Design a protein around this ligand. Structure first.
Ligand SMILES: [Cl-]
Ligand SMILES: [Cl-]
Ligand SMILES: [Cl-]
Ligand SMILES: [Cl-]
Ligand SMILES: [Cl-]
Ligand SMILES: [Cl-]
Ligand SMILES: [Zn+2]
Ligand SMILES: [Zn+2]
Ligand SMILES: [Zn+2]
Ligand SMILES: [Zn+2]
Lengths: 381, 381
């Protein structure tokens, strides 16, 4: 078909970059992060919506792989919070090992330049994002180390409130948006060059973050509230504030977020949501955020990662221009990561002070006096 | 003086690379890792044996900065172990922030090539090592992420036994050397390209590690047992096994490890220890491992980081040849890091399997059946 040729051409011209995929958590569920001698299965998985053969088949240009761990359930909150930090390092480890063992398919990327160079070489640009600030164990130091490990976005919450922000699906509210810590963390995320992700956060937390952020943010996997009312979807108010922010809403394939009856959801609904946002806040502020492997079943026509050419063909079929389709595929999310990087270099170049943790005093006054007396003895030599 | 000119010339020809310095822990003790607007103090410290002015003054070519945290003291061992992991990320964070805020003095290095390029540019090559396997919280995944954060050696223990090995200063013995886990970790450390450090470990743990390791190891800060009997010093047996291993013993400035009476220790004692090892196992297997800021007071003549030219002059004065002095300064520890890297590329190139953690089952059989049924539905489309 001519439109199917056109869609294939576009997929090889520019990278389709998906905002969120939980294939690393499926590896923890199925293999327990032990992928030694499991290549046959990693190429042809017995479960889930993602494997390395179907990933090639769908012609996906890039992917933000989720390093998600669940919200802590231990009655002791100290242990649960610290356990989530260790599990985060396990999920970051298996993502890096997945990329390293399959260098012909996957290539690690942490910037706009590294995405393109990966795409030139014919590989899926493999980026990383964590899903919730519960994963850092209230450590801004840990968060900066996660950035060094290759994490390029942070979802502020998952399905639990944390010290920084409110989740959408939990009531009652704790902070009623962002906390005082949350507001201060937004500055630090902008300074370090970490992309803010507003999926899973409450409507009020989105509004506050969209006004405060000095860099553009994303919704890694969220849909439109006006088409389908849900706590996880983006309101018209926040869509307009996203436009002012210069951010991107990456549209989700979750059936509950697309239709009132989940079994009615389809590829056509995903296209309706993309066109709604593209019409009202422009096609330079819309993306694709599947949430594959964060669900059991997908919409009719978007059942797995091999189905991306049908989405590209569907957008072209409805009258979205080539240039606008390319924007929705990946050019927009590349721009946001590029602008997040530019703002960070701007603020770091100006000598902005970093957010430090509240650390305990480890020395008493007796130890400090011994140290000062010792220093003055050395000065007299 | 002619020997003082000779020592200065050598310090500018090749980098003096010190094996261990705890200046990052002094920053946690004094500043609580908040170095914003503390440049005047970081250049001229009111405490300790290390600051950025004296670091320049001593003409030090490189440094393995310690990312040490104390052995956990919480009655609950789960919390203490997990707390040590968070504190490790705080210490790695402040080390990276220290290097980043002073790029004229310090430059990050994680290899032999990066050490030289830093030294060509006139900067102190800033490498990182953790002091104890209690710091990883029994996570090999975490350990691989610490390698990604820039850690290039791991001391197997500090002053506490862990699941992998026995410390020297604690009795009774737990494992009587390395555990079964410890033996398996040695293979993983060789595979990933992590330099093994045998300081603080028991004599039997050293012997076992020296026989098992496929790459050369180091003693980041240890002295000679025959000259001064102490649990922390290296025996003649282990010195010979270090020779077969192709490793390096980096001589310590700790007064307790150099003399029976601590106040009698001197620069001359450090030179006696270097010459003893250099005479018996060759000068290509000896280094300098100060342990500055891991003590209150140093030996007479080695009171702080400005005193390295006196050590170089002292070695030349005793009749150690220029080429042998250059080896002790840094060429030896560069070689070990180069060989550790070569062995890792060798083993990784041959497709050796990595050590995985013991992870809990997160899905029951009901969830796995839903996933397999869902996959087969997709196959039929
Ligand atoms: Cl380009
Ligand atoms: Cl609007
Ligand atoms: Cl699921
Ligand atoms: Cl060279
Ligand atoms: Cl011997
Ligand atoms: Cl001390
Ligand atoms: Zn997810
Ligand atoms: Zn989600
Ligand atoms: Zn130390
Ligand atoms: Zn020590």
């Amino acid at each position: 078909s001519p439109i199917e040729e056109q869609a294939t051409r576009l997929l090889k011209e520019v990278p389709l970059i998906d905002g969120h995929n939980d294939f690393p958590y499926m590896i923890r569920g199925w293999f327990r992060n032990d992928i030694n001698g499991q290549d046959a299965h990693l190429y042809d998985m017995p479960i889930g919506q993602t494997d390395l053969q179907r990933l090639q088949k769908g012609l996906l240009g890039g992917q933000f792989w989720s390093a998600f761990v669940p919200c802590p359930k231990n009655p002791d909150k100290e242990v649960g919070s610290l356990e989530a930090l260790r599990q985060t390092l396990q999920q970051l480890d298996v993502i890096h090992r997945l990329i390293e063992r399959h260098p012909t398919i996957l290539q690690f990327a942490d910037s706009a330049a590294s995405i393109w160079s990966s795409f030139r070489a014919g590989r899926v640009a493999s980026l990383i994002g964590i899903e919730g600030l519960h994963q850092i164990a209230d450590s801004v130091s840990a968060l900066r180390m996660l950035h060094r490990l290759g994490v390029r976005y942070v979802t502020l919450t998952h399905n639990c409130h944390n010290a920084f922000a409110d989740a959408a699906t939990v009531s009652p509210e704790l902070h009623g948006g962002l906390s005082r810590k949350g507001e201060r963390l937004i500055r630090e995320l902008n300074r370090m060059g970490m992309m803010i992700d507003l999926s899973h956060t409450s409507h009020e937390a989105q509004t506050q973050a969209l006004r405060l952020s000095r860099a553009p943010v994303i919704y890694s996997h969220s849909s439109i509230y006006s088409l389908r009312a849900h706590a996880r979807n983006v309101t018209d108010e926040n869509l307009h504030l996203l436009h002012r922010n210069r951010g991107v809403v990456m549209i989700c394939f979750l059936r509950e977020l697309l239709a009132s009856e989940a079994d009615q959801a389809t590829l056509a609904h995903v296209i309706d949501h993309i066109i709604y946002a593209g019409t009202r806040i422009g096609y330079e502020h819309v993306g694709i955020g599947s949430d594959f492997d964060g669900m059991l079943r997908g919409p009719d026509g978007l059942h797995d990662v091999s189905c991306y050419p049908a989405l590209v063909a569907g957008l072209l079929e409805r009258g979205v221009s080539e240039e606008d389709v390319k924007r929705v595929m990946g050019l927009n999310v590349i721009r946001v990561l590029e602008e997040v990087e530019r703002v960070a270099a701007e603020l770091q170049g100006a000598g902005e002070e970093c957010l430090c943790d509240e650390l305990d005093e480890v020395w008493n006054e007796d130890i400090k006096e011994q140290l000062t007396r010792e220093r003055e003895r050395v000065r007299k030599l």
